[PDB]
Every structure is written in structure tokens, then in C-alpha cells.
Amino acid sequence: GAMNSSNYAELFNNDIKLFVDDTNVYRVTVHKTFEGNVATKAINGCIFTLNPKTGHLFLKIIHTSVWAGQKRLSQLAKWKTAEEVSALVRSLPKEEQPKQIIVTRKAMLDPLEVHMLDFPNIAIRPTELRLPFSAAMSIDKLSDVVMKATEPQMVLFNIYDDWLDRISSYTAFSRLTLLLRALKTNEESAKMILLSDPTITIKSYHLWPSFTDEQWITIESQMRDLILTEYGRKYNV
Amino acid sequence: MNTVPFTSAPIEVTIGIDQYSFNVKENQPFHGIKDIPIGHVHVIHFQHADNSSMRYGYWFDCRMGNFYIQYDPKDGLYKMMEERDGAKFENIVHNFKERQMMVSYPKIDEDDTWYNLTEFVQMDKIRKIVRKDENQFSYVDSSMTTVQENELSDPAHSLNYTVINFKSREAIRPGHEMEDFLDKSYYLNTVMLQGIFKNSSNYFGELQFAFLNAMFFGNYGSSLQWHAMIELICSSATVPKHMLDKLDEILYYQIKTLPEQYSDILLNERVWNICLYSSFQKNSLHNTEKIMENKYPELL
């Protein structure tokens, strides 16, 4: 059934699972036409598919050409996502295929269920968590590869960098979700917090700065402050 | 006109013949039902006074033999049976008519209700859904489950309706996932109509049989089947025109006949709102939509 706060530790057991988020697949800018009407211009997207135990981010870039001449693009987008997840599973050796795929929006269940009829033993599940994966386009390197793509293209990163060498999946997922939630709530302040100190660098294959343990604690504390504050500024408290 | 005599009425029972019904008191002198119109299927059903649980009855066609009802005190139900001795049967029926111990099938001459609710229902097809080939009549009751319900437990006593499942490999062509799921014309026209049912009369015949079993016996799985077969049509962008015009009539009469107080359990809010207001065929069921909105505007 649905994934919620009560069965949260299942994410970190040894059953392979993926999270799939489709928020950023179909993206537009809205602008005025010469005649004073409004039109959209699509920009590149991505499917955010993530193994929460290993940190593997299978990032599938969606190039604007995929929409050309199509109607009902918000609905097509959900199916286009399901088609790509399905192709990804089929590309993986059997022992690497997920036993469960958890979709972050309920509108994805039927498109993915239908694309995965070939895989009756893969459970397709929703969640009651309000996960901040839509903020993934606030991660500079992810946004850069998405925006520069001139064709469809799959890119790979470990969203946990090398963290698992020192911390558990559980803690690594909790850090990731705190960083994303902060980037979603106040992007500028979140980024200032991460990059203020020029001496902490981001390695070439990594997405986040190379913080020591003590520095991650400071950072984590500063993101929690941010999220509590903006929640006052937003609700005046 | 034909006759279904009864040996006796040993227990108090509400007897139904098609859309009509009447109360028989324990050991009342009742010897059966006369003037049954030839040329249609019929259903004679029972609800005991002591146990409103278990409605049951018998689908039959008087052209396929001489049938009678006889209470069985071991199994405790009114059983349909066939008499093969045609002379014995006529003699018995004549005796009972002379003494006037039979109720008359009470058809009004303006009334085509039963015809319109059974137009495509044929005994030979009923017998394939209700597997019991040693009898020319078919027993149904409230508790019998469907072949798809047993997939989701006794196979001999099930209803073998045609399995319809919108999220199945049969319904969905590789490479047309979104196309085939949002627009079920492939599945209706090629898989089901050309492939399984062969024509729209047989399709409509299962649909009508499913509806009647739902109404008369409160059979939950028949109710599911009836809604399924409606939804498949309504969710197909491409449907022969004659089938839509007939579907509208079919449903019109089913809605007209449904007991007003049973609407809450026999009608699925989601299916009907989808069919009447969101589906490809939302503008195609003028008679059905008009009676639905005037009789059950609550459901919508």
C-alpha cells in the first residue's frame, strides 16, 4: 500500500526499490505574445528516479523535442515518465531490477502500472510523505546537464556523494531530504549556506561540498533554522 | 402460453416470476404459474419468509422442455425439475387449471418491459455462463461468485462471465499503453467483440443477464460485470452507431425497472458519472441520461 511515516524504515532494507518523481518532466515558461495573448514555451526536463539505499540517481533528461506536435502535454508527461521508467527496468539485469517502485504523485500509479504489466512481481506504490524531490533542479550540476542537453540523454550521479562511507542510508536520506526541503523553501538562503565558505569545495563527480563531519552538523543545523524561520515568515509566528 | 406447475408450497415464500412477485403462505393451496409468454427466457425466483438470506431461482425457456417446481425437504429449497413424460405433464397441468390453483403471468398488453430487458439474452448462452449441462434450466443465487472473483472458490458453482480487466495485457497493446488505456476501442472492438463475443448481440446478452442477476438476486459479481461492460463501451472513442443507440435503450429500461430503494447498492456512482459526463460517449446516451437525472439525481 502507501508509504508513510509508520513504515519509513523499509526504504533502507535490502529489497531493491526506486523512488520516481515526475514534477520536473514537463516544464514551461509562460510569456505574452505579440498580440497580447499568453503562450507557453517548454524547456528541458528530467525524470528523477532514485535508489534511497544506494544513492543512485538515474537522471533521464527530457528534451523539448519530445512534445513537438503533441496535445495534452501534462497528461502525456505522466505516460512519458512511465515509459521511460519501464525502459530503465528492462535495461537492468534481473537481479538489479527493483521489487518496488514508489511514485511521488498518485497520478503516476496508473501510467506506470500499465507500462509495467510485463512485471507483475514489481509492486507500484504511492506515498503519503511530502518529499521535496522537485527541488532537484536547484542542484547546480543537475540543472546544468538538463539545460545544456540537445537530445534525450540519461546521466548518472550518486546523490549521496561519498557519504555512505561514513553514515548510514537512513542518515544519508535524511540529510538529502533536509537539503532539498531547504532549497525548496528558500533557494537563495539554502545555497548561501552551502557555498558561503569558499574553502569547502565540490569534487568533480560529487554534487555537494566536501564537508567534514563537524561541518555537516553545522550545515544541517543551519538548514533546520532556515526551514523553521521561513515557516514563520510564511505563517507570521 | 406455457405453464410451470408446482407439486406443492410447503413453506412460506415470496415467489418471483420475471419482474412480478407474490406471497405464498405455508401449505397454501398453490399449484403453479400459467400463461407464461412463449418466446422469451424467464426467471422464477424465491425468497423464503424465514430467511431473506439467499435469494435463488432458475433461468429457463419453456420451448426447451416441460418444467415444474417441487420443494425438497432435505436440501430445503424449491427445486426446478424437468418432466420427460409429456403426457403425464399435460394431464397434471390440466387437472390444476380446471381447479384454478395457478396464478396467471400478469402481462399488460401495452407492456414490452420484459422483452426490452431480455432482448439479447439466449438460454444457450446462459448455460455457458452457469455450467451445469445435465439440466436445461440454470440455477443462480445471491452468493455465487464469478470466475474473476475466484481469481481475486468452488469452480462448479460459479458464474463464468467474460473476464474484462482494463489493466491487463489483453486490454493493452505493447507500444500503445497510453493510447489503449485512455481509449479502449481496441479492447472493445477487436479483442472482445470480434474476438470473444463475435457480435454485439452476444455482448449485449451477457450485459443484460448480468444486470438481471444483480437485481433479482443481489449478486454482487454480476453487478460488477454489468458496470464493467457499460464502462468498456463508454470509454471507447470508436463504437458502431447502432450499438450506442441500442445501449441507450437497454440501459434506459434497466434504470426504469430498478427498485428505487435499491439504487444505492446496485448503481456505482463512479461508473455512471464517468459514463454520462466524462466519457467519449457522454453525449450519446440521451434516453439513459434523462431518466438517470430525473430519478436518481442524488447519485450524480
Ligand SMILES: O=C(NCCc1cccs1)c1cccnc1
Ligand atoms: O555511475 C556512478 N556510480 C555507479 C552506480 C550508479 C548507478 C546509477 C547511478 S550511480 C557514478 C557516476 C557519477 C558519480 N558517482 C558515481
